[PDB]
Amino acid sequence: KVFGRCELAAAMKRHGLDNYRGYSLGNWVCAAKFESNFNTQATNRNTDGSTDYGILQINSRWWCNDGRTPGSRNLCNIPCSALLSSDITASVNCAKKIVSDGNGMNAWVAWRNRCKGTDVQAWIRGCRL
Numbered sequence: 158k159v160f161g162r163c164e165l166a167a168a169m170k171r172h173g174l175d176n177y178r179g180y181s182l183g184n185w186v187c188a189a190k191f192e193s194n195f196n197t198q199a200t201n202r203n204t205d206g207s208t209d210y211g212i213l214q215i216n217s218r219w220w221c222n223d224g225r226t227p228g229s230r231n232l233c234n235i236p237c238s239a240l241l242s243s244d245i246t247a248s249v250n251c252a253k254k255i256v257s258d259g260n261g262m263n264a265w266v267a268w269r270n271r272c273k274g275t276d277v278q279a280w281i282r283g284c285r286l
């Protein structure tokens with residue numbers, strides 16, 4: 158599924174991300190825009206042999222199992238293909254574990270480089286929330 162911008166704010170909000178670990182909803186829409194272009198089905202391979210899956214581009218070296226990432230962990234206890242669903246539930250619940258882990262949202266490269274320190278409220282402007 159390719160979300161609309163307000164459609165995904167609204168959904169993120171329903172699954173408890175506005176202000177999760179102190180990260181306001183715009184930070185998240187912004188991360189999802191630059192990671193996945195808003196598309197639950199986005200996959201990207203990495204040089205280490207890992208792959209990034211779904212709307213938030215969560216990595217198979219630590220968080221999900223894809224069966225082809227040797228010696229990797231599955232810290233969210235789900236196959237990686239669960240992260241490509243039109244229902245962003247599993248992506249959200251795994252994202253809450255990742256943002257808890259010590260480095261906050263800096264774990265999303267593209268958040269760090271494209272969203273951090275910017276006016277991220279602009280990602281939810283106009284939306285009926």
Ligand code: NA
Nearest residue numbers: 217221229230
């Ligand atoms: Na894994």
